[PDB]
Scaffold this active site. Structure first.
Site, PDB file in Angstrom:
ATOM      1  N   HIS A 193       1.514   8.597   5.265  1.00  0.00           N
ATOM      2  CA  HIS A 193       0.569   9.591   5.732  1.00  0.00           C
ATOM      3  C   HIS A 193       1.114  10.491   6.869  1.00  0.00           C
ATOM      4  O   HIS A 193       0.856  11.680   6.853  1.00  0.00           O
ATOM      5  CB  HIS A 193      -0.741   8.984   6.190  1.00  0.00           C
ATOM      6  CG  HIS A 193      -1.628   8.581   5.069  1.00  0.00           C
ATOM      7  ND1 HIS A 193      -2.344   9.489   4.308  1.00  0.00           N
ATOM      8  CD2 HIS A 193      -1.932   7.358   4.593  1.00  0.00           C
ATOM      9  CE1 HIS A 193      -3.032   8.827   3.393  1.00  0.00           C
ATOM     10  NE2 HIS A 193      -2.827   7.536   3.570  1.00  0.00           N
ATOM     11  N   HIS A 199      -1.041   2.656  -5.294  1.00  0.00           N
ATOM     12  CA  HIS A 199      -0.933   4.112  -5.611  1.00  0.00           C
ATOM     13  C   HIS A 199       0.352   4.608  -4.917  1.00  0.00           C
ATOM     14  O   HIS A 199       0.910   3.931  -4.052  1.00  0.00           O
ATOM     15  CB  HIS A 199      -2.145   4.914  -5.078  1.00  0.00           C
ATOM     16  CG  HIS A 199      -2.415   4.655  -3.632  1.00  0.00           C
ATOM     17  ND1 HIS A 199      -1.583   5.116  -2.634  1.00  0.00           N
ATOM     18  CD2 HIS A 199      -3.345   3.881  -3.020  1.00  0.00           C
ATOM     19  CE1 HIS A 199      -1.993   4.656  -1.460  1.00  0.00           C
ATOM     20  NE2 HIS A 199      -3.077   3.923  -1.666  1.00  0.00           N
ATOM     21  N   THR A 254      -6.902   3.481  -1.938  1.00  0.00           N
ATOM     22  CA  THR A 254      -6.674   2.068  -1.764  1.00  0.00           C
ATOM     23  C   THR A 254      -7.806   1.159  -2.275  1.00  0.00           C
ATOM     24  O   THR A 254      -7.564   0.230  -3.067  1.00  0.00           O
ATOM     25  CB  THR A 254      -6.339   1.783  -0.290  1.00  0.00           C
ATOM     26  OG1 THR A 254      -5.140   2.472   0.031  1.00  0.00           O
ATOM     27  CG2 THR A 254      -6.128   0.297  -0.042  1.00  0.00           C
ATOM     28  N   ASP A 300     -22.423   6.546 -28.639  1.00  0.00           N
ATOM     29  CA  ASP A 300     -23.902   6.639 -28.658  1.00  0.00           C
ATOM     30  C   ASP A 300     -24.527   6.127 -29.964  1.00  0.00           C
ATOM     31  O   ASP A 300     -24.024   6.381 -31.062  1.00  0.00           O
ATOM     32  CB  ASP A 300     -24.362   8.082 -28.480  1.00  0.00           C
ATOM     33  CG  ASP A 300     -24.043   8.660 -27.093  1.00  0.00           C
ATOM     34  OD1 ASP A 300     -23.617   7.942 -26.126  1.00  0.00           O
ATOM     35  OD2 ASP A 300     -24.236   9.896 -26.978  1.00  0.00           O
ATOM     36  N   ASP A 351       0.825  -1.193   0.000  1.00  0.00           N
ATOM     37  CA  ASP A 351       0.000   0.000   0.000  1.00  0.00           C
ATOM     38  C   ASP A 351       0.874   1.264   0.000  1.00  0.00           C
ATOM     39  O   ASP A 351       1.843   1.421   0.801  1.00  0.00           O
ATOM     40  CB  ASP A 351      -0.925  -0.085   1.204  1.00  0.00           C
ATOM     41  CG  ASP A 351      -2.047   0.891   1.157  1.00  0.00           C
ATOM     42  OD1 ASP A 351      -2.028   1.878   0.403  1.00  0.00           O
ATOM     43  OD2 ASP A 351      -2.980   0.682   1.902  1.00  0.00           O
ATOM     44  N   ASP A 404     -21.005   7.117 -20.691  1.00  0.00           N
ATOM     45  CA  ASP A 404     -20.629   5.747 -20.329  1.00  0.00           C
ATOM     46  C   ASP A 404     -19.288   5.336 -20.964  1.00  0.00           C
ATOM     47  O   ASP A 404     -18.827   4.207 -20.782  1.00  0.00           O
ATOM     48  CB  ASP A 404     -21.746   4.752 -20.636  1.00  0.00           C
ATOM     49  CG  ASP A 404     -22.062   4.593 -22.142  1.00  0.00           C
ATOM     50  OD1 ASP A 404     -21.542   5.297 -23.067  1.00  0.00           O
ATOM     51  OD2 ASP A 404     -22.874   3.698 -22.457  1.00  0.00           O
TER      52      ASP A 404
END
Ligand SMILES: *[C@@H]1O[C@H](CO)[C@@H](O[C@@H]2O[C@H](CO)[C@@H](O[C@@H]3O[C@H](CO[C@H]4O[C@H](CO)[C@@H](O)[C@H](O[C@H]5O[C@H](CO)[C@@H](O)[C@H](O)[C@@H]5O[C@H]5O[C@H](CO)[C@@H](O)[C@H](O)[C@@H]5O)[C@@H]4O)[C@@H](O)[C@H](O[C@H]4O[C@H](CO)[C@@H](O)[C@H](O)[C@@H]4O[C@H]4O[C@H](CO)[C@@H](O)[C@H](O)[C@@H]4O)[C@@H]3O)[C@H](O)[C@H]2NC(C)=O)[C@H](O)[C@H]1NC(C)=O
Ligand SMILES: Cc1nnn(Cc2cc(C(F)(F)F)ccc2/C=C/C(=O)N2C[C@@H]3CN(C(=O)c4ccc(S(N)(=O)=O)cc4F)C[C@H]3C2)n1
Ligand SMILES: [Ca+2]
Ligand SMILES: [Ca+2]
Ligand SMILES: [Cl-]
Ligand SMILES: [K+]
Ligand code: NA
Ligand SMILES: [Zn+2]
Length: 805
Positions: free
Chosen positions: A265, A309, A159, A691, A121, A687
């Site tokens: 952090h 990340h 995460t 289309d 992580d 989306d």
């Protein structure tokens, strides 16, 4: 209720999960408060620590010990990972030279090499170079195996979205885990990090790797670990599972570490306190590899070392407050931090208006450190809009900053020095990938790639058919020694018509005018050959794109460009042209300023008309092939054909005109010629897919001319820039964009300035992969090159990010 008075005797870290209220002994029981009474005693043994010592060698098996150094430990599969080193004079895996693993060297009874995913992580990509002195085991995996300089996470770079993307191959908008924090309005339920709602199966869409494996007869270790199980115990558990009998033993395993994120952090990505967490992670890898080596599995297992990340410097003082912009701040709910998501506090408040919120947050302070968007206006490369869990209003936050609603939020919650969650192109958000084993290549560096691709590769490593996902299967074949996936190009669904001259000028009543009635046998055969496709090999370098859906369209040839013209949408689906290094930019001559010419190959009934544009006070028009780059004054008439025309808001024309007049020539000079393919995109339902006609929400007033939501360009040249784009012998180089077709330039805070100060910056923000454009148009590019298809797939997934080193 859990009847916690059953027993974990012989059941420790059981692979099948048992039903409430029978008590659990699996690696998640702690998280549910459901473990049997004796779980800690039997399963989480710690006595005498994690390493053999000289005096423990050949000891009498004591079942209380965390791991073992008795003679029988190898056959039991529960030795301390350094057993053979301390007690049998073996070397640590890291101290052995590396040696190519050409074939799996597995114990008898193994049907396939196992896959172990070692996930870390917050492991930022630059730690591989910057921490290399303190990570010898990881550095050995990296230099001996296959590695990328970095791996691009998905947005948001948190995460939960990223680990589930790794597991499924899907964008967060499709798998449903769109943040660490979420409100689903259909469920009327909230997903939070702390708490129980997150365990409900309704949040988690798609099909993760452990389910894909189980459905196809491949057994999986449980991927998730309770926070309180120590790392050494997770490793020992994996190694114990690897010693199971052939019919019980999993083929795929995951390890997860909360580090280095947990420390990043607190101390920032490069805080001096960061060295120890990196050392500790490296020691854990060392224990796995030494443990695999003891089991004679070190040349059998494929190991993936992967991050979710990276981590950026972020402090409390770098916080913008919505209370500094909004009077009504108490009528909103904000999801805060390194992104913002805003909705109404109460759906009973009819005075809430997203339009006025957006405006109040737009370009209000000179150095403003976030930018508001309606989600459908976010860069398409983020794929972050098609989910009811994503709020209509989104704030893209600058790297190094936070957004919060009110100052009280920040000081009644400086604690932290690092965070992440920013735009996934940001350098500090990039993470790592290393693959090591018999199926990976030896000592090979591969280009950076996106984490959406790995699910396919993990399926390939296990001989599984992947569930439908957002990877492009084959684009990572270059990582692999064998088990490559050999796809075929998709079949073209619609073939073009090739119309000749079929209409007289006077049949067109389009309200168009052009000053062109100005009158040779040498030059008449010349224009005829151009209209029949004689320069097509110059302007269509990689074959015509294939149309992968059912539709009616025409190929139109011209001296300077070729187009695939849609009879349904009344404009090109694509326009292709090559601009050499030597090409000259000219201006639009005065007599031609408002010139639009009927195209005698295409019926009035399938043409745009000028009157619609005159009547539509909001809408103007542009051209896909730029008149500025015509090869000759005679060829310039072709660029004014009604079939080269597309609807454009005047604010967008500023963008488009600068790209076409200035930037194309600039790229051709820098890249030694470029091939350009441009066209419209229609994605009214956000989306990420083309289309159909019945999805179009806006037309040029009083016509059936549909208005594109975006304009794309794909700009291709030779990777070896000593060769001109039109005479390239080897690999290609591409950059692309998908620019939002907007009636204002509110997105660009400096737009009152000259285009040279803001347009290229906008284009860079809306950088795209060719594959993004394929989904959005139903087209398939690069059909005719000399290159291998896997190589072209890699090219189509390339993203030019415009971040420095
Ligand atoms: C990235 O890769 C993925 C995976 O390939 C791509 O996503 C796929 O896109 C397809 C096209 O949009 C889509 O196909 C639809 O499937 C519907 C059946 O859906 C269920 O079954 C599948 C298979 O098990 C399952 O995966 C779905 O899971 C989704 O929904 C649940 C919620 O229950 C979530 O838990 C999960 O996270 C996932 O959510 C995502 O997808 C849905 C849309 O399906 C979004 O709304 C969410 O926001 C979220 O992003 C499902 O449980 C099927 O019903 C559809 O068929 C309709 O449309 C066709 C058009 O051909 C029409 O012919 C049919 O008649 C039908 O229309 C009828 O229903 C309409 C809607 O109610 C109605 O308006 C009409 O009038 C009709 O009566 C459709 O075929 C597929 O489900 C997803 N899969 C996933 C996993 O997301 C994605 O496109 C790729 N992205 C890019 C950019 O390329
Ligand atoms: C989420 C999620 N989706 N799928 N998984 C399973 C999984 C997949 C794969 C892989 F790569 F193979 F796919 C590898 C490992 C796995 C298994 C992973 C696993 O045991 N976890 C991941 C959870 C995260 N977590 C947190 O409390 C947490 C929340 C936010 C942040 S932050 N601030 O960095 O955003 C950091 C955190 F630690 C509890 C951890 C237990 N986890
Ligand atoms: Ca993380
Ligand atoms: Ca669409
Ligand atoms: Cl979030
Ligand atoms: K107009
Ligand atoms: Na502006
Ligand atoms: Zn974190």
């Amino acid at each position: 209720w859990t009847a916690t008075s059953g027993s974990c005797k012989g059941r420790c870290f059981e692979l099948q999960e048992v039903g409430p209220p029978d008590c659990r002994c699996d690696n998640l029981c702690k998280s549910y408060s459901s473990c049997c009474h004796d779980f800690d005693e039997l399963c989480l043994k710690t006595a005498r620590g994690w390493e053999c010592t000289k005096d423990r060698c050949g000891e009498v098996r004591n079942e209380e010990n965390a791991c073992h150094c008795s003679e029988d430990c190898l056959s039991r599969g529960d030795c301390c990972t350094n057993y053979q080193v301390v007690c049998k004079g073996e070397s640590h895996w890291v101290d052995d030279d590396c040696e190519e693993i050409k074939v799996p060297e597995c114990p008898a009874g193994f049907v396939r090499p196992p896959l172990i995913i070692f996930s870390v992580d917050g492991f930022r990509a630059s730690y591989m170079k910057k921490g290399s002195k303190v990570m010898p085991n990881i550095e050995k995996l990296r230099s001996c195996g296959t590695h990328a300089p970095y791996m691009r996470p998905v947005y948001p770079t948190k995460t939960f979205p990223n680990l589930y993307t790794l597991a499924t191959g899907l964008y967060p908008e499709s798998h449903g885990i769109v943040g660490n924090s979420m409100y689903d309005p259909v469920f009327d339920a909230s997903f939070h990090l702390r708490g129980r709602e997150k365990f409900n199966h309704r949040w988690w869409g798609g099909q993760p790797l452990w389910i894909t494996a189980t459905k196809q007869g491949v057994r999986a270790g449980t991927f998730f670990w309770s926070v309180s199980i120590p790392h050494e115990r997770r490793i020992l558990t994996i190694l114990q599972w690897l010693s199971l009998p052939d019919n019980e033993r999993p083929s795929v395993y995951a390890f997860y570490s909360e580090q280095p994120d947990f420390s990043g952090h607190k101390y920032g990505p490069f805080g001096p306190e960061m060295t120890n967490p990196l050392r500790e992670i490296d020691k854990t890898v060392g224990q796995l590899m030494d443990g695999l080596k003891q089991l004679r599995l070190h040349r059998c297992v494929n190991v993936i070392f992967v991050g979710d990340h990276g981590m950026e410097d972020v402090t409390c003082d770098r916080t913008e407050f919505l209370s500094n912009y909004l009077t009504n701040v108490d009528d909103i709910t904000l999801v805060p931090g390194t992104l913002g998501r805003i909705r109404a506090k109460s759906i009973n408040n009819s005075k809430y208006d997203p339009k006025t919120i957006i405006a109040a947050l737009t370009c209000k302070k000179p150095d403003q450190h976030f930018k508001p968007y309606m989600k459908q206006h976010l860069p398409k490369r983020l794929h972050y809009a098609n989910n009811r869990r994503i709020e209509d209003i989104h704030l893209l936050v600058d790297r190094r900053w936070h957004v919060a609603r009110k100052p009280l939020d920040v000081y009644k919650k400086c604690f932290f020095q690092g965070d992440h969650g920013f735009d996934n192109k940001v350098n500090s958000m990039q993470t790592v990938f290393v693959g090591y084993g018999p199926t990976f290549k030896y000592r090979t560096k591969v280009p950076p790639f996106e984490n959406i691709e790995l699910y396919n590769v993990m399926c390939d490593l296990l001989g599984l058919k992947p569930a439908p996902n957002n990877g492009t299967h084959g684009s990572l074949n270059h990582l692999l020694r064998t088990n490559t996936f050999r796809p075929t190009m998709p079949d073209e669904v619609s073939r073009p018509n090739y119309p000749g001259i079929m209409y007289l000028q006077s049949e067109f009543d389009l309200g168009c005018t052009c000053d062109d009635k100005v009158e040779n046998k040498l030059e008449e055969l010349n224009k005829r050959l151009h209209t029949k496709g004689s320069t097509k090999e110059r302007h269509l370098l990689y074959g015509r794109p294939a149309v992968l859906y059912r539709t009616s369209y025409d190929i139109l040839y011209h001296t300077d460009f070729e187009s695939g013209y849609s009879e349904i949408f009344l404009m090109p689906l694509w326009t292709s042209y090559t601009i050499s290094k030597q090409a000259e930019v000219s201006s639009i001559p005065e007599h031609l300023t408002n010139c639009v010419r009927p195209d005698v190959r295409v019926s009035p009934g399938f043409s745009q008309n000028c009157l619609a544009y005159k009547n539509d006070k909001q809408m103007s028009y542009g051209f896909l092939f730029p008149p500025y780059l015509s090869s000759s004054p005679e060829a310039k008439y072709d660029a004014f054909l009604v079939t080269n025309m597309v609807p454009m808001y005047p604010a967008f024309k500023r963008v488009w005109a600068y790209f076409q007049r200035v930037l194309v020539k600039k790229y051709a000079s820098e890249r030694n010629g470029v091939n350009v393919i441009s066209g419209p995109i229609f994605d009214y339902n956000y989306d990420g897919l083309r289309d159909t006609e019945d999805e179009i929400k806006q037309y040029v007033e009083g016509s059936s001319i549909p208005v594109p939501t975006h304009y794309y360009s794909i700009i291709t040249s030779c990777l070896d820039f000593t060769q001109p784009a039109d005479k390239c012998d080897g690999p290609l180089s591409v950059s692309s964009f998908i620019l939002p077709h907007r009636p204002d330039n509110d997105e660009s805070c400096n737009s009152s300035e000259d285009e040279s100060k803001w347009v290229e910056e906008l284009m860079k923000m809306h950088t795209a992969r060719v594959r993004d454009i394929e989904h959005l148009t139903g087209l398939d590019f690069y059909r005719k090159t000399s290159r291998s298809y896997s190589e072209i797939l890699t090219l189509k997934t390339y993203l030019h990010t415009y971040e420095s080193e």
